[PDB]
């Protein structure tokens with residue numbers, strides 16, 4: 001009978017007896033010296049009940065947990081596999097830091113319930129090399145704290161790849177640097193985290209479609225139709241300046257992300273029914289590639305040019321599949337571009353066809369999507385129906401292929417104000433465990449979804465998951481002060497820092513890790529409803545905060561209390577900007593800075 005761990009082990013050879021965790025147990029590193037593995041092991045030692053010392057000098061003994069890093073095992077166990085023995089001691093043998101670490105993830109689960117585990121052994125190597133979560137941190141901003149928690153959880157489930165579509169605050173093109181974005185130090189923090197948790201980051205700037213977050217202030221680069229009308233999201237790929245612009249932004253992003261892979265998106269650009277409307281793309285294609293060339297040939301050539309560009313710096317390219325629709329009559333997509341398949345239909349090239357072409361193909365089905373305000377992946381249905389990466393949108397493969405890389409779930413903010421990032425974090429719990437299970441490749445844990453959900457809940461988040469205190473103030477009434485001023489209602493549903501104000505606020509924690517902030521004077525709730533919206537969210541730096549009737553569903557009325565010693569800052573759950581005094585008039589506005597407030601019980 002195999003152990004109840006998630007993902008499940010690839011095989012299990014059961015034995016008699018049980019390993020018990022005792023006070024004498026040590027963590028023994030009896031392979032090669034590796035600082036990373038040692039640091040990991042010291043955290044792991046503390047994640048167990050009791051006081052296990054970590055050592056690298058002494059021989060292992062019964063009762064110990066032995067972490068044996070043997071580089072000679074790289075052929076057999078790969079970069080991520082391990083060999084587990086649950087005997088009179090526990091032994092994890094791996095070739096790499098990552099392999100050891102994943103072994104320790106299984107060990108924490110084996111000992112979780114009562115510090116006992118039934119004996120046996122397993123060679124546990126992942127069935128798929130890419131086991132991922134994708135986060136579109138686009139328009140909105142997703143907190144680095146939220147990402148750190150996701151990365152810990154991913155690691156705890158042996159997920160190894162985090163796709164992030166996001167804007168780096170640009171020095172190359174400051175005209176693109178409008179919120180949401182990540183500063184370069186924030187990106188470096190993210191990179192730091194991913195390295196610590198054994199995760200590969202896959203950053204994206206979308207091109208040549210979905211570029212409205214970059215081209216809003218470059219109308220000269222926008223694609224025009226036969227009537228001269230610009231498509232703001234779409235780069236004019238007929239123009240040399242367009243590739244120069246895009247590759248410049250890629251270069252800047254790759255500098256900081258420092259990733260092996262670049263994902264350029266390349267989803268939702270054009271279909272063949274539009275070709276009478278883009279005769280300039282047609283002319284450019286035929287000038288370069290002859291009488292049969294299409295705008296889709298130009299599209300593919302643009303992608304191949306980016307491929308060549310990033311390969312020059314040792315990088316590898318990825319794209320979404322949907323623009324591969326059999327209309328590139330002349331220009332094949334370079335074979336070393338990984339294709340992430342999310343959708344089928346019409347003449348969109350089938351997974352079997354992509355795989356037969358020898359390219360890396362990832363299953364990134366829409367069915368594995370979580371969309372704010374929209375579709376939510378139905379983990380229970382996928383489990384009950386034995387989904388694996390063989391099951392693509394529109395096509396179920398009848399057997400494996402070596403070049404099927406794995407799978408990921410994807411988190412999209414399409415209706416950005418409809419859901420907080422903390423609600424999403426809740427909703428992703430079972431999706432994450434399901435994709436980890438389906439891509440690691442062991443047998444199904446229980447015949448019912450119920451039992452899988454029970455096992456996942458029992459195991460819980462990763463150790464060290466929680467990295468914030470979401471409830472640092474007892475629900476109650478508080479003055480929020482800075483110097484001589486307090487937060488107060490002002491003219492026309494405005495809120496301001498008013499000198500000598502005795503105004504107060506009812507702060508109540510919400511279910512999703514925020515607070516409603518309700519004026520004692522007026523009875524209305526602090527909200528963000530003014531300024532420019534993207535995806536329905538109030539994302540304008542400098543927008544005024546205001547008061548509105550309190551609502552159970554307005555996510556813009558939810559505030560995160562970001563703490564220090566004597567003070568707090570208020571972060572809007574949706575915009576992720578902080579309440580800031582506008583110097584000119586004292587108005588409370590939302591910015592990437594913050595006004596520090598002292599909460600004084602009233």
Ligand SMILES: CC(=O)N[C@@H]1[C@@H](O[C@@H]2O[C@H](CO)[C@H](O)[C@H](O)[C@H]2O)[C@@H](O)[C@@H](CO)O[C@H]1O
Pocket residue numbers: 136138165206210265267268320342369371374412413414
């Ligand atoms: C590959 C894919 O899923 N494409 C569509 C998604 O489009 C992304 O949308 C985000 C904003 O939410 C951003 O603009 C990004 O650059 C786009 O690729 C997304 O809408 C998804 C979820 O409904 O559906 C797809 O159609």
